[PDB]
Amino acid sequence: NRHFIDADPYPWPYNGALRPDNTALIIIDMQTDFCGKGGYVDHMGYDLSLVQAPIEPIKRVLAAMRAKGYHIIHTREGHRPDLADLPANKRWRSQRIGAGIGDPGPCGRILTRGEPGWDIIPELYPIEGETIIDKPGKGSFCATDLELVLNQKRIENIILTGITTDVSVSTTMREANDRGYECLLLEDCCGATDYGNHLAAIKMVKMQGGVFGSVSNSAALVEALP
Amino acid sequence: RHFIDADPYPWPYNGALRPDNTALIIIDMQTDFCGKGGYVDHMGYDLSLVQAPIEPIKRVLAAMRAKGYHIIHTREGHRPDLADLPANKRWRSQRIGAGIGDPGPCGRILTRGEPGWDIIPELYPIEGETIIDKPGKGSFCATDLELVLNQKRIENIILTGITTDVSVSTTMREANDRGYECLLLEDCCGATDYGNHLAAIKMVKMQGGVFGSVSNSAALVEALP
Amino acid sequence: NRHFIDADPYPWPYNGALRPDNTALIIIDMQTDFCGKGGYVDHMGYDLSLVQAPIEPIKRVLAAMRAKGYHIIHTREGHRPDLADLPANKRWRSQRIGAGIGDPGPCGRILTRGEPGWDIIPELYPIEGETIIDKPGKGSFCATDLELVLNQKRIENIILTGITTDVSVSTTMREANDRGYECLLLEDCCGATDYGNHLAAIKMVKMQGGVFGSVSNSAALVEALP
Amino acid sequence: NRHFIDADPYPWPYNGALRPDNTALIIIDMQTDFCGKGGYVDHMGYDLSLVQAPIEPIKRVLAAMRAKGYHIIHTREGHRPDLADLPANKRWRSQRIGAGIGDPGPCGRILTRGEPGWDIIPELYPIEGETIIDKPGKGSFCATDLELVLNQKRIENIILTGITTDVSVSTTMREANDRGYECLLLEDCCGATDYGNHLAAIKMVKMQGGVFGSVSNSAALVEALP
Ligand SMILES: [Ca+2]
Ligand SMILES: [Ca+2]
Ligand SMILES: [Ca+2]
C-alpha cells in the first residue's frame, strides 16, 4: 500500500507508508510577529516579503491535507504574560535591537501570548480538531506536549512548513528527526530573515543522503498526496 | 564582568564568565566524522573540511583545561543491538553506501565500542571530563546532558566540533532554547559542505544573536579568565 | 546565612540555602475534579473528606509564602477539549469505572480544560504572577514547561502540597528529585483516595536518609519560614 | 486476535493487543548495590532478603519472554566516575547515612559506573540484543534514551520488574504511564527496603480503575504469555 512524494534526495517518506492516520502537516509560527507589519520581525527591519512568500503555498497544502483527513498541527512561538518561560538572554537580545519581547508595540506586547501580534494570521487560522502547540523556544518539542500528542496519534511522518526556515522550522525538523520522525520540508512553504540562510537550511536537509529527511514543494505534494 | 570579542555581541551577554559556570563542549570529533575509513569518508566528503578544526580545538581545550573549566565531549553513536537507531536514519545511511551498523575498515559504522566511533586521539578525554553518548545529532535529545549541566550550574557553553550544520548547530539550538548562553567558535567547526558551514555560522548572528554569538579560537584563548 | 525547617529525616533544605528567590511552593491539582462534589474523584466513589482535609493547611502555607515573596506555582491536571493529549489507556480506565475523562458530568466535561470542574478551587486560587502548569499527566514535568520555568527563575527548592499524595504529588516529587531539585513534602497539606496509601507515600520519602527529600508539616513550615 | 494476562484491577493489556513486537520486559536495577552484600542497600542496613526474593521469579519471566522473542530491557542506576551526573542533595543524603555514592566500599565505589557493585547481578545478566539503560536517577525515562528506544521499536506495553518497588520501579511506571505506555507490574518480581512500602506501591497502581496500569505475578504471566 505504498505511496511517495517526489522529493530530493529521496522519494518521501522513505518507506512509502504515507497515510492520513500516520502523517501530520505542521504549520510553524505563521504569526503576525514573524510575518506581519508592526510585529517582532518588522521591528528588526527584515524584509517581510521573504516571510510572506510562503503564505499562499501553505494555504494550498493546508486545503488539500484538510480535504483528505490528515492531522493538522499549528505552532505559535510566544511567552506567558508573566514572562516566566522567557530566558534572560533571549529577552536581552530582543531588547538590544529594539524588538523587546514583552514590550509594547503596534500589535501589542511582542511575542506575548494573548496579544494580537502573537496570534496566527487569519489566512492560515486553525479550525476545530487541529492541535495548536504554544512554545517558548524555536524548537516545537522543547518544553511542550508535542511529542506526547504525536505519540498518542501514532504519527510517523511530518510535513514541515512555516517560518522562519533556518530558526523555528529547522530546529523543529532536527528535533523531530532525532526522535525517529520522518520529515518532509516544503521549500516553497517556508521563508527566512535572509534568503541565503533560507536556501542553506534547505540544502542542509539533503546532505548525507537526507540527514534530516527530504525536500519537496507544494505542487509536488498536492499532486501525489494519497 | 568578562567578555570575549564576538559577533554580534560581546560574549557572554552579561559578562558572567567564570570557570565554575562555563563549559567547553567538543562535539563528535570521532574517526567516523573526520577520519579515513569512517562514515563521512564513505559518503565521499572532503575530510580536510572536517579536519581543519582539530588544531584550533586543541588550543582551546588546552587553555580551558589549564584554567579549570568544565570540559564535555560528545560521541554520536548507537548500541551494538541498534535499539536506539531510527529506521529512517539507518535506511538513509545504507542507501548512500555508509550504513550505520554495517562493517567498514574502522569497524561497524557509528556503533558504540568500535574503533571508528571513538574520539580521535588528538582530542581524547581525560579523567573528570564528561562524555555524552548520543543517538541523535542534538546533544540534549535522549541524553543526560541537561541533568549534568544543571548539577554543575553551567550557564555558558562554548561549542566546538563537527559537523557545523548538523550536530553542532542542533546542539546549539537545543541549548539556546533552554536558556543556556552559547558561543560558537567558527574556526573550531567544519562541515561536509563549506557553504553550509558558513551559513550555519551566519544563522547564529541574525536577530541580534538568535542562537548566541560567534568568535574564534585565538580571541577566546586571549580573553579567557 | 543558613535556614532550616524542622523535618524528617533531615532538616530541610539539606544545605540550609532557603531563600525567597530560590524556593517555590507548588500546589498540585487542587481542582474540583479531585476534591469537590460532582467531579472525577467523586464519580469514582472515593471519600472526599480525605482530599478536602489539606485545603486549610495549604491555605495557611500559601498565605505565609505569598507574604514573604516566595515563588508560587499551581498545577492542573487536564486535557485539551479535543483530547489530543489524552492517552487511550488513561481514557479507557476512567470510562470503565464510570468517570470518563471528557465525558459530561455535573461539573462539565471531566478533567477537560476550560470546564468548571477542572478549575482550581476558589480557596486556593492563583493570583497574578503565579505560574500555572497545565499538565496531561500525573507528573508535573512530563510534557510541560515546568523545568524550563524553574531553571529561568533559578529555583533549587520546592515545597510540595496538593492532591493526591500517592499519584500527582508523589510523581511530581520523584521527577523533581531525579533532576536535582530539593523537595519538602508537607504531610498535612496532601491527601489521597486511600488513607494508608497517603501515609505510605509519605514514608517512602524518608527511606535511605531521605531518598526523595524530607517531610514536614504546615505549622513547622510557617514557624520557621525566613 | 486479543490476548490478556489475568491482572488486578483489569485484564492486561487493556485492549488485548499483546504481541512480541510491541511488548517489552524491563528489569530495573537488579544490581549488587541494591540487592547484594557489601553494596549501597546493605550499607544502609536494610534486609537483603526482601530485595533478593524477586530474583528467581524475574528469572522465570525473563526465560519465557526471551524464548518467545519479546524485547528485553535492563536498567542500572549509577553515576559517571567523575560524578558530573550526581545531584549534590542525592550525594549528601547517601553520605549522611554511611553509604556515600562514589565512596569506596567492599564492592568498589558505591553506585559508580564501571564498579563491581554497580553491575547487574550474574543471575539476570543481559545477553546480546538486549538494551541496557544507564540512568543517574530513579526514573528510567529521566535523562536517558529509554523513550527514544521504545518509540523506535514501537513498544506499547511494558512489563515492569526489579527493585526497589517504591523507588525506581514505581517512578519508572509513573513516567511510562504518563506518556501513554501500558504497564503491568509483576508483584512477586519486585521488592523494597520496607515490605509495607512494597505492598503500598503495588496497591497505588490499582486505584481509580488502574491509575498506573495493572498488577499480576510471574506465574500468571508465564501461563498466558502468547
Ligand atoms: Ca585524526
Ligand atoms: Ca539555563
Ligand atoms: Ca537543579
Author numbering:
A (entry chain D), C (entry chain G), D (entry chain H): 8 to 233
B (entry chain C): 9 to 233
Sentences reproduced from the published study:
Herein, we have described and characterized the structure and catalytic mechanism of BiuH, a cysteine hydrolase that hydrolytically deaminates biuret during cyanuric acid catabolism by R. leguminosarum bv. viciae 3841. BiuH is structurally and mechanistically different from the ‘canonical’ AtzE from Pseudomonas sp. strain ADP, which fulfils the same physiological role; i.e., it liberates a nitrogen atom from the triazine ring and allows further degradation to make all three nitrogen atoms bioavailable. The protein is a tetramer (consistent with SEC); each monomer adopts a five-stranded parallel β-sheet which is surrounded by α-helices. Helices α2, α4 and α5 (residues 95–102, 178–186, and 202–213, respectively) make symmetric interactions to another protomer in the tetramer, forming a dimer, as part of the basis of the quaternary structure.
As Cys175 is the only conserved cysteine, it was probable that it was the active site nucleophile; indeed, substitution of Cys175 for isosteric serine abolished catalytic activity (without impacting protein folding). Given the relatively minor change to the active site relative to that of the wild-type, this structure is a close approximation of the Michaelis complex before the nucleophilic attack on the substrate by active site nucleophile. In the Cys175Ser variant, biuret has an extensive hydrogen bond network with both sidechains and the protein backbone: Asp36, Lys145, Thr171, Ser175 and Gln215 have sidechain interactions; Ile170 and Thr171 contribute hydrogen bonds from backbone atoms. The active site Gln215 is provided by from the adjacent monomer of the dimer, which protrudes into the active site of its neighbouring monomer and binds the terminal amide that is distal from the nucleophile. The pocket is further constrained by Phe41, Tyr47 and Val174, with sidechain atoms of these residues between 3.2 and 3.9 Å away from the biuret molecule. In this structure, Ser175, Asp36 and Lys142 are within hydrogen-bonding distance of one another; suggesting that, in addition to Cys175, Asp36 and Lys142 comprise the catalytic triad for BiuH. The amide oxygen closest to the nucleophile, which forms the oxyanion during catalysis, occupies a pocket that is formed by the main-chain nitrogens of Cys175 and Thr171. It should be noted that all heteroatoms (oxygen, nitrogen) in the biuret molecule hydrogen bond to the protein in an exquisite arrangement that makes the protein specific to its substrate. Comparing simulations of the Cys175Ser mutant and the wild type revealed that Ser175 adopted a number of conformations that placed the nucleophilic oxygen an Ångstrom further from the appropriate atom in the substrate when compared to the wild-type. Combined with the relatively higher pKa of serine, these results help explain why the mutant tightly binds biuret, but does not catalyze its hydrolysis.
